[PDB]
Amino acid sequence: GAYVLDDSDGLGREFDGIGAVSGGGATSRLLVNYPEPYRSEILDYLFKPNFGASLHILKVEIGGDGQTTDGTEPSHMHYELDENYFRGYEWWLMKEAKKRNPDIILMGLPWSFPGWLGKGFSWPYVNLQLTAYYVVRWILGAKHYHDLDIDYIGIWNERPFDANYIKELRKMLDYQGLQRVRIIASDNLWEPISSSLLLDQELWKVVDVIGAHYPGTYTVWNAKMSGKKLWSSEDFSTINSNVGAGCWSRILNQNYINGNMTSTIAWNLVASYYEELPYGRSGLMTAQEPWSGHYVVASPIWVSAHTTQFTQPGWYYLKTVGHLEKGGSYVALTDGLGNLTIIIETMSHQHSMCIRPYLPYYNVSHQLATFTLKGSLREIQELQVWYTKLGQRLHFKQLDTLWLLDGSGSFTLELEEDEIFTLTTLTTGRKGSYPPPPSSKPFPTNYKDDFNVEYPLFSEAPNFADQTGVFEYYMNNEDREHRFTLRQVLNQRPITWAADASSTISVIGDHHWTNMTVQCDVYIETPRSGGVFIAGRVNKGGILIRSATGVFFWIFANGSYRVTADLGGWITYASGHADVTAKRWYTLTLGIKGYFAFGMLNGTILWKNVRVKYPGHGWAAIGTHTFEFAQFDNFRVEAAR
Numbered sequence: 001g002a003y004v005l006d007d008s009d010g011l012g013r014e015f016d017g018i019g020a021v022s023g024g025g026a027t028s029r030l031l032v033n034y035p036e037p038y039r040s041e042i043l044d045y046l047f048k049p050n051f052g053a054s055l056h057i058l059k060v061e062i063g064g065d066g067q068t069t070d071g072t073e074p075s076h077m078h079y080e081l082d083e084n085y086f087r088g089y090e091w092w093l094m095k096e097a098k099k100r101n102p103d104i105i106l107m108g109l110p111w112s113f114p115g116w117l118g119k120g121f122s123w124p125y126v127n128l129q130l131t132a133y134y135v136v137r138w139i140l141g142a143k144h145y146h147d148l149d150i151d152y153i154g155i156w157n158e159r160p161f162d163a164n165y166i167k168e169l170r171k172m173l174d175y176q177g178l179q180r181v182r183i184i185a186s187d188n189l190w191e192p193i194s195s196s197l198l199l200d201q202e203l204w205k206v207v208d209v210i211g212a213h214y215p216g217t218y219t220v221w222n223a224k225m226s227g228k229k230l231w232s233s234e235d236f237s238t239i240n241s242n243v244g245a246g247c248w249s250r251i252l253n254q255n256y257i258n259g260n261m262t263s264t265i266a267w268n269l270v271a272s273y274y275e276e277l278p279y280g281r282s283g284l285m286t287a288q289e290p291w292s293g294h295y296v297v298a299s300p301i302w303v304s305a306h307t308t309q310f311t312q313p314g315w316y317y318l319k320t321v322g323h324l325e326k327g328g329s330y331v332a333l334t335d336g337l338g339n340l341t342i343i344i345e346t347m348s349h350q351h352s353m354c355i356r357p358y359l360p361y362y363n364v365s366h367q368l369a370t371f372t373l374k375g376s377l378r379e380i381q382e383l384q385v386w387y388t389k390l391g392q393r394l395h396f397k398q399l400d401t402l403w404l405l406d407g408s409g410s411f412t413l414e415l416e417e418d419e420i421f422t423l424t425t426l427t428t429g430r431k432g433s434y435p436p437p438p439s440s441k442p443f444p445t446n447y448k449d450d451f452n453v454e455y456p457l458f459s460e461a462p463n464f465a466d467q468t469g470v471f472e473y474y475m476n477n478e479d480r481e482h483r484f485t486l487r488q489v490l491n492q493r494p495i496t497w498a499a500d501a502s503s504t505i506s507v508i509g510d511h512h513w514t515n516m517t518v519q520c521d522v523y524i525e526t527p528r529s530g531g532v533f534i535a536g537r538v539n540k541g542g543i544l545i546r547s548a549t550g551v552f553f554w555i556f557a558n559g560s561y562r563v564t565a566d567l568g569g570w571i572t573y574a575s576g577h578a579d580v581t582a583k584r585w586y587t588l589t590l591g592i593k594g595y596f597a598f599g600m601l602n603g604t605i606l607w608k609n610v611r612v613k614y615p616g617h618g619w620a621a622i623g624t625h626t627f628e629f630a631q632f633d634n635f636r637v638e639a640a641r
């Protein structure tokens, strides 16, 4: 009926901000080679204040060289004694975010770890000081090399925590003058972290925020008792159609209302990874075509704006928030300066499903909502109105100001299903607009890269999406013909988050490709036991990279070759001997058309008219037999979709 909004009995919890995740894993991979101005425009839609999603929080993966959902991300310490703070693209992304929003909040969190941290075990808690040292060096490097202040450091994404590790991490941060860095734990479920904090005063002292993943808007009693800030430190992960916007809309309000969570952070920030990788197009917007410049400002961007443009971290929720009589919810916030923001959502069940969890049916129907401003809100003769209707549709439209000048501090509105209203004293709102970007286009059907770049802007050549191992631009000054190559740089299995393959692999191109010729120069660095491959029709990647089938053309340093149907090498198409050794360059060609494949070694047929599965489709790929050094040069692909 009537809903009272008031602050005379005090405020709710402090609001900590809305954010998104770049990482877990390689979700921003394809953003870095967007041409200008589109790349800058994408970033404006994400981070520019009073424009698009206007995000308050950016959380990034701390790469550990393992597969972490849509690819690998490179570590700052590939090996013991190795330190490099310029690999990958999270440094670049954090700086671009800070340029747009100097007050953006920065978080880092590991998914995988370089294998050498485990000292012979796939376990990061073998040497607590060593793992803490590794993580803290990332934070120091962020400051020393990029002028980035990391505000929050997590533990181990969706993996066990170790209470002694968390304490050592606090001790190490303090030892390095990083008292201001806060710890969030444990980026998994509410338990066991929540009860651990009630039982261990020392643990309680060093954990600042309980961060839980996909809580379905609820928390648990132990977490409320702790007194700690509670965050949905990872949510969303739903395709960014209108359904995902509805999911984002509902949980943004109800994570606080139902579970006292004062921050929600969406996985992921932007869908800049091939769509047929796991969880495709599950970013706040889509930018997965750097070759064309095409991107899509999806509905979740404007759902975000309904909160972010009219709140800031440090505002406070009112005590008077809740659900509507006939479905939906409302929150309200103030900044203690006379501003008020009211956010109303009526997302229907059929149109707001997240992937995790699935809610049983709830009803939503037309209703009239009356709001009355009591307490300090009593003045406020006017409020600005921003409106979105999902599903068709209209996004983030500014409507006529509502006037409360009748002395009652009261208004009403006709709500229907799947709407968002933001009513605010703030006058800074804006629906940012750039002109439309180029039309969508498939990955180029002829594509080449000679890797000849002496000072690359990023550590890896464009469009190559590593799915196990790490491939990087490599300069060999002791050579003239292959001075600039692409090298696989892992020499041992990471402490894995995913089930990384036993072979390294980087995929590129158009997943719909069915007939293709792939060519590449390859160089095997390990004598006798080394091996490399080129492939096509590679059908799976990311978390499922172990499952990948296709056509794989292997050569080995013992003078042999293999043609397999699977990355694991269990299914043989052909095999035989080849004039192949380590430490010399060979040019591999693989042609796949219809039912048949052929392979050439240095332009001479090695095997031909070999029967392969068909129909079949997938990316092109390169890689190495195990975690071993190898180089690649003069990559070429021609394909038909």
Ligand SMILES: *[C@@H]1O[C@H](CO)[C@@H](O[C@@H]2O[C@H](CO)[C@@H](O)[C@H](O)[C@H]2NC(C)=O)[C@H](O)[C@H]1NC(C)=O
Residues within 6 Å of the ligand: 013, 224, 256, 257, 258, 259, 260
């Ligand atoms: C966390 O939020 C819950 C609600 O989601 C608060 O719970 C009680 O909620 C009912 C109705 O939902 C109110 O009538 C009670 O007054 C609330 N309890 C109290 C003590 O006020 C709960 O208070 C919140 N916990 C915090 C802020 O620590």
Ligand SMILES: *[C@@H]1O[C@H](CO)[C@@H](O[C@@H]2O[C@H](CO)[C@@H](O)[C@H](O)[C@H]2NC(C)=O)[C@H](O)[C@H]1NC(C)=O
Residues within 6 Å of the ligand: 335, 337, 338, 339, 425, 426
């Ligand atoms: C609403 O918010 C704005 C921005 O936070 C407030 O205006 C600022 O007020 C502070 C002092 O309170 C000044 O130092 C800033 O220069 C102001 N900035 C802008 C952009 O105006 C405003 O006071 C708040 N209250 C109301 C009723 O608007």
Ligand SMILES: *[C@@H]1O[C@H](CO)[C@@H](O[C@@H]2O[C@H](CO)[C@@H](O)[C@H](O)[C@H]2NC(C)=O)[C@H](O)[C@H]1NC(C)=O
Residues within 6 Å of the ligand: 514, 515, 593, 594, 595, 640, 641
């Ligand atoms: C990929 O290659 C196969 C084999 O050449 C193509 O299939 C043939 O297409 C022709 C003309 O379209 C037909 O007359 C044949 O009967 C097809 N054969 C088979 C076995 O399908 C296929 O169309 C090609 N696809 C692309 C996208 O180029």
Ligand SMILES: *[C@@H]1O[C@H](CO)[C@@H](O)[C@H](O)[C@H]1NC(C)=O
Residues within 6 Å of the ligand: 363, 364, 365
């Ligand atoms: C939802 O509520 C309305 C109003 O009470 C009712 O008419 C309608 O049948 C309900 N729908 C479901 C699926 O419960």
Ligand SMILES: OC[C@@H]1[C@H](O)[C@H](O)[C@]2(O)CC[C@H]1N2
Residues within 6 Å of the ligand: 023, 024, 025, 068, 069, 157, 158, 234, 237, 267, 279
């Ligand atoms: O929905 C998938 C999500 C994504 O893959 C993130 O990497 C993760 O941390 C791991 C699973 C979940 N959260």
Ligand SMILES: [Ca+2]
Residues within 6 Å of the ligand: 450, 451, 452, 482, 483, 484, 485, 633, 634
């Ligand atoms: Ca080269």
Ligand code: NI
Residues within 6 Å of the ligand: 276, 511, 539
């Ligand atoms: Ni497919």
